[model samples]
Target: FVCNTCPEKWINFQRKCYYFGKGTKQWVHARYACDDMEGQLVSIHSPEEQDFLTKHASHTGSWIGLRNLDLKGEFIWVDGSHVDYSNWAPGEPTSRSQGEDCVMMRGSGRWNDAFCDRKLGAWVCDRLATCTPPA
Candidate 1:
């Protein structure tokens, strides 16, 4: 039997639901937007998930839930998941001087650290699909 997929404007992948944030937003505001929907940015676990999102990203790039805020060296997902797997491009996590702490996915699907305040391309949010019916 085919189960109903994600709600309107959301794409179902694997067992989770994803929403692409059109237009541009700074990393902080992008995160807030996702939170407003009760979803804190999408956390990727493997290469397939990363590839899935990379293909869906906007022309320039899109912000993900990964960042190195608390500790300058250690990165963490917005959802507090450990970064056991990653798809960083060559010489990634550059940790540039101007505080490139936030992460964005380039059009080629590689991860890069970008300044949090600079308004980038887009974002993607994910949450479990509960499929509830209105009474």
Candidate 2:
């Protein structure tokens, strides 16, 4: 169900579209870049999705839509959905003294939490085939 109207840079997967943003920026800035593209940061809910992302995004570290901003130690997706699935790396979410509230995917395709304001980070955006995204 891919849409012909989807931008050229967006990759189609099933009925959804994904866009990888270049350069490194703070997590918030990365999120903004995604939203500006009419989508949100990639949210991994399953192993397959994570695999797809690591294949097309920064293998080193790319911010995703998981964060524990509201409640410490309790992560949630940007849409406020519970983290039904997780892929944290060993000893991840170390929760540094300043706080590791945002999540990123490492080269191994595993996840880890980091400070929300980390200036060096890449990001990916995802939305449905049409203009709107799923809830």
Candidate 3:
């Protein structure tokens, strides 16, 4: 579903489109999909965006923007920057099984550990940007 109304309202950055309608995928799969397009799961920088995410997400555990699979236990975002945002729910990330190194939104935008293949409500990502992001 494409939004033809209020193009600027739906346009993220300059070229990116909102993934609010694309039912969510697990963290790794979502990242893989985003990477194929030269993008990464969305990065939240403001309360407004956070509210938007909370509103669109599923009540069930949903894959999120953080992952540590690359180095195991050393969690960081795909943007190559330290995580400055965390909305984890209580007693989260127990990683129930043994793998599950990614984060997700629960308790209304809170973090949790979940299966990578499990489908989710919704997620965000970045489309290849030439300009470096903020530090």
Candidate 4:
């Protein structure tokens, strides 16, 4: 079943979950937002999820975990996951008009929409089921 409100809980199916900081934040800011909420907002691994995200995007590209922060096209996840999945849509992460350096959930769930470094929105956070915090 789907979890509700999650907040700081990002579902890491096959070890991934991405996001797009809307237009409020750039991709880096989105990542920061994820960190604030205790998440990573990285990537997707399923086709259904990808479609869902792409549909949501519908022309408006979002943001994700991947970023050209230090370099260009250096695809990588916040959780240090491998860079295997790539659904950049048709002309996404294109670095078109402005030089966007972050990734987002654009087009579909499986599709990734690269964004800038200042947009604002919720980010994907990886939930690590570590032992209880000394409860």
Best by lDDT: 1
User: Which candidate gets the maximum TM-score versus the true structure?
Assistant: 1
Candidate 2: tens digits of C-alpha lDDT, residues 1-135: 335456779987656678877787988888888887788988777777877877886755778887775446577788668887778898866664234388877767788878888875577788877655344
Show pairs that collide, candidate 1.
Answer: none
Give all candidates' CA lDDT scores: 0.81, 0.75, 0.60, 0.51
- TM-score of candidate 3 versus the correct structure, residues matched by position: 0.63
Worst 10 contiguous positions by lDDT, candidate 4: 1-10
Model 4 lDDT on a 0 to 1 scale? 0.51
Is 1 or 2 the stronger prediction by lDDT? 1
Judge candidate 1 against the unseen true structure and give its global Cα lDDT, from 0 to 1.
0.81
**lDDT, residue 9, model 3:** 23
Q: Give the TM-score of candidate 4.
A: 0.55
True lDDT of residue 129, candidate 3: 25
How many residue pairs collide in each prediction? Answer: 0, 0, 3, 31
Tens-digit lDDT track of model 4 for 1-135: 232223332333332333333446665665666676656664555566566555545354456666554354455676676567577666655654243355655434433444364454444444433232332
How far in Å is the alpha carbon of 20 misplaced in model 2?
A: 1.2
Pairs clashing within candidate 2: none
